[PDB]
Amino acid sequence: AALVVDNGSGMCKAGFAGDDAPRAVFPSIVGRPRHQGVMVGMGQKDSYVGDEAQSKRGILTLKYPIEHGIVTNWDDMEKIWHHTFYNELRVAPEEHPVLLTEAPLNPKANREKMTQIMFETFNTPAMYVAIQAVLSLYASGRTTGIVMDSGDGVTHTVPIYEGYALPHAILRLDLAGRDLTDYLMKILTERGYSFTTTAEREIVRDIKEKLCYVALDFEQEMATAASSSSLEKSYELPDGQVITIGNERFRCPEALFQPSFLGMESAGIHETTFNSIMKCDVDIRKDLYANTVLSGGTTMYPGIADRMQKEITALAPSTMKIKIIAPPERKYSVWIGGSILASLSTFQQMWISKQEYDESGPSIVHRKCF
Amino acid sequence: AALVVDNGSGMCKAGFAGDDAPRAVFPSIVGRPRHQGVMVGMGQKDSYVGDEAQSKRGILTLKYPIEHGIVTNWDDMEKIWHHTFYNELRVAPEEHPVLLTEAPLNPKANREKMTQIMFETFNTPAMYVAIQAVLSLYASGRTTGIVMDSGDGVTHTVPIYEGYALPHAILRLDLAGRDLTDYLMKILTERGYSFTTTAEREIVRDIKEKLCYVALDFEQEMATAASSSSLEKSYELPDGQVITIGNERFRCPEALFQPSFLGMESAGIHETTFNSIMKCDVDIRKDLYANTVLSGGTTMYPGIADRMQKEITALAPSTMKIKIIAPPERKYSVWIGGSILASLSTFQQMWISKQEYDESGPSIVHRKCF
Amino acid sequence: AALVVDNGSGMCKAGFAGDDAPRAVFPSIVGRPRHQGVMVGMGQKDSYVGDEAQSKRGILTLKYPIEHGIVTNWDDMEKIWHHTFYNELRVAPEEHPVLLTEAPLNPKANREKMTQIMFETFNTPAMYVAIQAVLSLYASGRTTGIVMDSGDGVTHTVPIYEGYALPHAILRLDLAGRDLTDYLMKILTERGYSFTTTAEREIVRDIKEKLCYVALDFEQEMATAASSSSLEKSYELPDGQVITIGNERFRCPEALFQPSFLGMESAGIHETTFNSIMKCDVDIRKDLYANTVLSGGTTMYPGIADRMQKEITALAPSTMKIKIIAPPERKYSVWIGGSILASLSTFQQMWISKQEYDESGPSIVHRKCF
Numbered sequence A, B, C: 001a002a003l004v005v006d007n008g009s010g011m012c013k014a015g016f017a018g019d020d021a022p023r024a025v026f027p028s029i030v031g032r033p034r035h036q037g038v039m040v041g042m043g044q045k046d047s048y049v050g051d052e053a054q055s056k057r058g059i060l061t062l063k064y065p066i067e068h069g070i071v072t073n074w075d076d077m078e079k080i081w082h083h084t085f086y087n088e089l090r091v092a093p094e095e096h097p098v099l100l101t102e103a104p105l106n107p108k109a110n111r112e113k114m115t116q117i118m119f120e121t122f123n124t125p126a127m128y129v130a131i132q133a134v135l136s137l138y139a140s141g142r143t144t145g146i147v148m149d150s151g152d153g154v155t156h157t158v159p160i161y162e163g164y165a166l167p168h169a170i171l172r173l174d175l176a177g178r179d180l181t182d183y184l185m186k187i188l189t190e191r192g193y194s195f196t197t198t199a200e201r202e203i204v205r206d207i208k209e210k211l212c213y214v215a216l217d218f219e220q221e222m223a224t225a226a227s228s229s230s231l232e233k234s235y236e237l238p239d240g241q242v243i244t245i246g247n248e249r250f251r252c253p254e255a256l257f258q259p260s261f262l263g264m265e266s267a268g269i270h271e272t273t274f275n276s277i278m279k280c281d282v283d284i285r286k287d288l289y290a291n292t293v294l295s296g297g298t299t300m301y302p303g304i305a306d307r308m309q310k311e312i313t314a315l316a317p318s319t320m321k322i323k324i325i326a327p328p329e330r331k332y333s334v335w336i337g338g339s340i341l342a343s344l345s346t347f348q349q350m351w352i353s354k355q356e357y358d359e360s361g362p363s364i365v366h367r368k369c370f
Ligand SMILES: Nc1ncnc2c1ncn2[C@@H]1O[C@H](COP(=O)(O)OP(=O)(O)O)[C@@H](O)[C@H]1O
Pocket: A006, A007, A008, A009, A010, A011, A012, A150, A151, A152, A153, A177, A178, A181, A205, A208, A209, A210, A296, A297, A298, A299, A300, A301, A331, A332
């Protein structure tokens, strides 16, 4: 059975090919103590990975080895891979092919290191690297459509028509969930709440995943929030302190549609999707309008699908049918599509075998993987 | 076998590692005659140490070589150590490693002279200095919790989470049992009882340990004592005179929670414990609330745990469970925890050996001891 | 004539616009007696503000109404502002516009209450809030540069290019002079010096301002202080006691560059300044490197400019010219810049008039003040 590992910037999703849900979902963090241990004979490890780092984050410095879809710490990256195979899946990597995921327009040296590490450190028989947006189309059971995959590090759009991708129309933004979390930390200081440590960043991320939503009309929602307390929500901190947030619930997700909130000059996610469609041929734009698929955890905000449909309709011609496909399990669409692709009989010859890597080096990934 | 010596400001506890109770427990006093001996041929010593000084205190001037956890008379301190090893334990200090205890935030010269005396005067093969609050956590079988150790000279709080101590959150108060004894002497004059000599201070300390208690509500308790004689208690002096005390039973321990009674500007023990928790990271405050451990002889007043739980509950958020752990043997928690640590197999490489002291001087203690 | 009041966490600097130096500089403290008055017929006030509290601190409990650039006790704030206008400047605030200063990324309710108090308690005709780091650039006669303002409560960096600020690149640290005062307060216990009261904290602050300095190489300075007594200095306490400090002279300011000394996870001021520059556009980083401006009393340590240049040079590319601008009067740069700004003819139209506050409430400050 093949292994499907969807390694995003924030979360690592792993499982077996043919399954409908990942078997192991844990944060993609590496935590190291920042204090001095004083109790002798207790099981103090040098570093903590994944869930154990999240539970002990009070005395740890949490680090993300993947930043904006690019691995910045390969030594920490190997720890997460080691934790995935041996502690989460509890399998031997040398007996199963592994399917990896990567964002488009990534540096070439990034995927070459995955090729070298996966073959020389884990000694796997086969490995394939696939584009995350392409895999999301597999999970939706479609061959035509434009997929907006927005995770923790990268927001990218890849339009596919009749199984053919348009590389020139692929757009990538460095605006994602982690930037929204940092923006939420910045705007929470307006109410006197100070979150500065890496552990406190995880707390704010939990607040964002529970109380944030996308407003259908941002300006109208601002007036409603400034006239009454109907939109106010309360959140309990781990130490028992209760915080209350008002317009910050929809201001943080608004940075997706108005990147100028973060000082970025790039266009919003709605315009990026629209611009990607217009970069394609005119004869295929109609099918892309009605097959807009959302993927990634950053697309799980309530009301994001309705807001995208309203915004894209204002940009697209009035005669066009705008249909936003937002499956309830779109957070795992990349993994689910990877499981489908790995189980296909026509995919078994697309694997990069050990014999190919031995006679071609890490550069083989550029010839066999799109 | 290792030796564990807990040198408090007022009381000295000694024993062997692996034992559950100290073998030698005696006051940490040195007494010298203040009169002229007129009997020839009967054995007047120049000084008396420990119990002999306590029994002969009528004709002696009792001196404490340790004040506020800091040794102020090193010549007198050597007498107590010499009495401990040769008269109480009846062992050779050059054949056993010695584990000593010290309060946090002490002067660095205090533990350097402790190192020099152990290696040059007693020729101990090995030596180590441990924090008293850290040892108290060993006795309770915990790796997470905040320990409020209050003895005769020092009241300090050391929060520990998952075996890691937070040095920036360590708070120290110079208010302890000796200050309460002096305060009781001052307020006993309100009833006409005059205690001024050093010997009479020991009598008042015995009164404090037998009749004093902590009131759950000080204001209500004061009203009850002012309306009836139910709280009045009688104590017999060594000469046969009988004294009776009323509200002084709970006013003396009240100085722990209201240091302004002594003219001190610091906060009470409940606020010091709460402030130490609040100095820690938010993710670990919940565990410290439910694992508050009391240590030292000062926390032996009846009802002190209920008062501490009540005070911290009013300060902490209502959603946190306040649990004060006050074991019945907490007067020896520091020693018992020292006995456990000294017997650990993983502790045998933490000793400061004779060779290390010879090649580094007394300054080695700052590198190997926390 | 407009009034310029620079309400920092530790000091209050006030004066008239158009002047080159503040007319009144006094500590921002409010002291209240903690003992009982026994002499009748003496003019004992309920509270003391500023220099009077500093001179009578022996029998007072000193309280700072500002903590980390945020007013925590508004009732004590009106006492200081009343003392500033009527006792120090000896002017009626209802006849002069008042220019106030605030740190960036402050709670929005902080500057709303300042607007409300000025208009309703002091009835100022005009009122304005300016960012402290922006004002420091006015004093240096520059329109481009990054200002590292470090006072008693807040350390923040604000990059400005051609008169345009980059709000997304503004970084703020809660590490400042008061934290260094507490750190020196803690590490002075290593030599046996015990300071606990609020009055004793002012003594420790005076020691820091007179004997502390920034070492060019901290590790090399550690070796020098451990091999000789050339770095030792003597300071006489108010009661005549003489204290001597060695490596504590440069260890206390080192916490600015190594915040881990206080258990804080944030980066040093040298890295914070570099990070703010890196958050800016690439085309403006070269100008910011050569126009780094220091401001505030916490940047008055001898050798801090050389250390900052050395650290930033190690971080910046070798082809960039690092120039740290540290004018000898940088302790009053915020006020001097406010004096320049309030005297500009083009600034007279951005005052928040009384008619604007009346028709818009305290929320007007969020629209007219950056
Ligand atoms: N219910 C939710 N609401 C808002 N944001 C979410 C939600 N669930 C997850 N996220 C965000 O999605 C990001 C990661 O999503 P995902 O794409 O599933 O993983 P990765 O990006 O690591 O591949 C996280 O940073 C998180 O902030």
